[PDB]
Amino acid sequence: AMADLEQKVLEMEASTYDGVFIWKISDFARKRQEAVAGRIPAIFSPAFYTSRYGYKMCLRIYLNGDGTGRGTHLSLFFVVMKGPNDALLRWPFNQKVTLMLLDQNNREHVIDAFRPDVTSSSFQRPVNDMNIASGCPLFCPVSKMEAKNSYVRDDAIFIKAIVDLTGL
Amino acid sequence: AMADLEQKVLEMEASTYDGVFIWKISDFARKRQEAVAGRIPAIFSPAFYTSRYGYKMCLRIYLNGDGTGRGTHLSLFFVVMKGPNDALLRWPFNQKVTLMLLDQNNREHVIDAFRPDVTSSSFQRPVNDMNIASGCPLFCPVSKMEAKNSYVRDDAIFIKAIVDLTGL
Amino acid sequence: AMADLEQKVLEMEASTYDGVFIWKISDFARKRQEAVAGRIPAIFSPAFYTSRYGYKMCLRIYLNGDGTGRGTHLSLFFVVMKGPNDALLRWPFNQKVTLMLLDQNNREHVIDAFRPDVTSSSFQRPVNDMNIASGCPLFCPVSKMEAKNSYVRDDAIFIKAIVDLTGL
Amino acid sequence: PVQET
Amino acid sequence: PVQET
Amino acid sequence: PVQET
Secondary structure (H helix, E strand, C coil), X not given: CCXXXXXXXXXXXXXXXXXXXXXXXXXXXXXXXXXXXXXXXXXXXXXXXXXXXXXXXXXXXXXXXCHHHCCCEEEEEEEEEXXXXXXXXXXXXXXXXXXXXXXXXXXXXXXXXXXXXXXXHHHCCCCCCECCCEEEEEEEECCCCCCXXXXXXXXXXXXXXXXXXXXX | CCHXXXXXXXXXXXXXXXXXXXXXXXXXXXXXXXXXXXXXXXXXXXXXXXXXXXXXXXXXXXXXXXXXXXXXXXXXXXEEECCCCHHHCCCCCCCCEEEEECCCCCCCCEEEEECCCCCCHHHCCCCCCECCCEEEEEEXXXXXXXXXXXXXXXXXXXXXXXXXXXXX | CCHHHHHHHHHHHCCXXXXXXXEEEECHHHHHHHHHCCCCCCEECCCEECCCCCCEEEEEEECCCCHHHCCCEEXXXXXXXXXXCHHHCCXXXXXXXXXXXXXXXXXXXXXXXXXXXXXXXXXXXXXXXXXXXXXXXXXXXXXXXXXXXXXXXXXXXXXXXXXXXXXX | CEXXX | CEEXX | CEEXX
């Protein structure tokens, strides 16, 4: 009951309840390197929800790529987690999901969006703490951002997610 | 400063500031049993508020009944607590209160609602940490839910409260 | 990792994300005295924000005055802090700021408001944890409140801030 | 409402 | 969407 | 606004 409590407070500090989430990844160069080196290929973000008692979700990013994007792109996925109120929610999950890599000059962001594949186990009511993540393996070319550009500034980047609430 | 801090974080984690509160009671069978056995007749829920700096409230439930409902019903009460901003609020408390036992199939919930008895000490500005609870001793027959039915699922139930904000 | 975690939870407990903040200062007589005695001239309030990922701000009060108000008035200032999302925000800070000392009978509050001085270092993007505070040195005469009156009740006062969100 | 016992 | 690997 | 001292 020492570090465990901190982890809980940090995740609480990062929670949102309106389907909009902004994830700030610091120490970028290092994490990027640990991915490239295969020691830590992916990282989960803290959890957020569609409403106060809505769906519990988080994101997972591979700084050096997953699947078709391995070694060439930054891969970004959506994760449906086991929420405290899943018994009261409608399943499978079927809300539009938008993902973004924010340009820090706010000129041109990187973006993609999709409607859930309702047949996929990724969107069924969770039995485990988290379902299999799904989203965009070719989200962003490692070259574009990372290198020059204004996506990485003061060794950090901002990832943004927007879960459409139509019907909720 | 060890367990005390956790308790504070759990209550914080459960706080809401719009008068709507959903209380998930887990380990139902056991708590139900401890009530029936008289070791723990009632249980308080975490606190919630009508607004960011509004009234502080919580609920109290007797899994095996109170007063006229003892041994036959689940009794549910509303509790006005001493809030950090009570000096700035209007008294006595006079907002409509709705209480519900949620059906997990979402077909037919159990519900009741009342307007405060303004003469009752239960709704005056608190002098103690909590006023005397008041509400519904015959809220729900132990038979209806509990036994068969879809109010209890995976050993847990959901109690919901809605504090009308008219005038706030 | 003991007291440090508590401080974080208390500040979290006090955070708001809509530009409206109510700061309750307890143990007033004592803090007032420590200011008069010069041991603790000013006190910072917990942080609050304009939106979930907006500007991070706090207040600073001198219970026995600052500058032109030293020894005669309670001085209240606004503070722009280094926020986690400053790279994505527009600078300098240019939102209207309203400050208030709440009358506990709710008859006549003490109030003042200003538009930021965009040339001042106080409103530029922070390089340090906090910029130089700025606001109202002659906010409230120590005589008015403090002494008789209904601004101080049960040894505590309420300070309120409202950050206009026009354009945000 | 009815007060608790 | 495409599931992670 | 007036800066603090």
